[PDB]
Amino acid sequence: EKSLHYLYEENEKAQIRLLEDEVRRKMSERNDYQAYYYRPSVAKYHRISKEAADELEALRGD
Amino acid sequence: VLGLDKRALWGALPLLGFAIGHFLDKKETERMTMFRDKSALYGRPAGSEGKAPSW
Numbered sequence: 362e363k364s365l366h367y368l369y370e371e372n373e374k375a376q377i378r379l380l381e382d383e384v385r386r387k388m389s390e391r392n393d394y395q396a397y398y399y400r401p402s403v404a405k406y407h408r409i410s411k412e413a414a415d416e417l418e419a420l421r422g423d
Numbered sequence: 424v425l426g427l428d429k430r431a432l433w434g435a436l437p438l439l440g441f442a443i444g445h446f447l448d449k450k451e452t453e454r455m456t457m458f459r460d461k462s463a464l465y466g467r468p469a470g471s472e473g474k475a476p477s478w
Contacts, residue, residue, distance in 0.1 A: 362456075362458045362459050362460075362461075362462050362465065362478075363452060363455045363458075365458045365462055366455050366456070366457055366458045367455065369458070
């Protein structure tokens with residue numbers, strides 16, 4: 362019964378390993394999810410520069 | 424008979440390691456127990472919680 366329990370645990374670990382390999386392959390195929398296989402491109406600096414350029418329109422004067 | 428000097432008192436370290444390994448094996452067979460008396464070969468009929476475990 363100890364070998365039966367260890368075989369059941371190792372078999373379930375094998376199925377979860379195969380399923381996470383499939384999930385990681387489908388995630389790297391499409392680059393969909395935000396955890397792995399995702400390059401975070403941010404426009405924070407573009408919005409900061411646009412806000413600064415909008416702020417310096419008020420500063421234009423004499 | 425066998426001859427053991429004062430240096431044989433240093434041999435309590437491998438016996439302590441043997442006791443530690445036996446305790447870890449006892450903890451491992453204590454944990455590994457969800458199929459205990461529930462497999463279809465060594466099975467038990469209804470009322471298994473009243474009866475003692477087999478091992």
